[PDB]
Write a protein that binds this ligand. Structure first.
Ligand SMILES: [Zn+2]
Length: 256
């Protein structure tokens, strides 16, 4: 007797056990210039919020902005979904912060982390399509949407079309809400071109986002499909999509 059910064997590997969560940014500048495990780039929502003035004078400083922006886009062009989910996390948590402090998405003046939201978003979704979406999503109604939101963003501009498409749909299933979080900073940055119902969706996703949510949703989605998907190629593609999580040269922090 035993019962192998009470073991979360579906949870996969575990390199860090769950640990319960309870003025200098040069270490964050130096994290940006190197690839590292995310646990080495990690930081707390409230640590960043304490460091807003200072990290703001860094990301909006003119010196090397051209390099950090190209460098981030270079990583995101070659990174897998672990890199890109890391970038999406960093920018979602950064935005949420600058807003709380009275900032806004004004394309005039450059913010390193923000000036790449749309590039990073395009890159993630383009990599999402490397999955066997058909195997993953299941419900035909959900897969139908997800596949289309991925079609528009991945091919061409068409960001407004994908933002608008999401505003119409109810996002009570994980795959769509994920992609919504991905587009939330492209969404806000495109606020005066999208449907009012989009404008409201992305606004709320932004204010209701907590720093784990994107790497979380991506994790549990991939995790639970592969508790049953015995398919050899679907698993092989899932592995290709998320490459090294240690390929993040442009990333300044991984938020929590
Ligand atoms: Zn599968």
């Amino acid at each position: 007797r035993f019962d192998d059910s009470i073991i979360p064997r579906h949870h996969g590997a575990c390199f860090n056990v769950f640990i319960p969560a309870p003025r200098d940014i040069t270490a964050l500048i130096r994290a940006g210039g190197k690839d590292d495990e995310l646990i080495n780039k990690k930081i707390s929502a409230k640590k960043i919020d304490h460091l807003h003035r200072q990290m703001l004078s860094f990301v909006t400083s003119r010196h090397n902005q051209a390099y950090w922006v190209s460098c981030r886009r270079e990583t995101a062009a070659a990174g897998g979904l672990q890199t890109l989910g890391a970038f999406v996390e960093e920018q979602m948590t950064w935005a949420q912060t600058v807003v709380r402090h009275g900032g806004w998405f004004d394309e005039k003046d450059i913010d390193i982390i923000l000036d790449t939201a749309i590039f990073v978003c395009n890159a993630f979704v383009t990599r999402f399509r490397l999955l066997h979406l058909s195997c993953v999503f299941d419900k035909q109604s959900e897969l139908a949407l997800i596949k289309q939101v991925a079609y528009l963003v991945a091919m061409g501009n068409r960001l407004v079309e994908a933002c608008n498409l999401l505003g119409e749909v109810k996002l009570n299933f994980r795959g769509g809400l994920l992609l919504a979080f991905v587009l939330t900073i492209p969404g806000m940055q495109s606020r005066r071109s999208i449907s009012a119902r989009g404008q409201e969706l992305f606004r709320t996703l932004l204010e209701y986002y907590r720093p784990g949510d994107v790497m979380g949703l991506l994790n549990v989605i991939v995790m639970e499909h592969h508790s049953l998907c015995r398919n050899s190629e679907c698993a092989a593609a899932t592995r290709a999509a998320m490459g090294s999580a240690k390929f993040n040269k442009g990333l300044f922090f991984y938020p929590l």
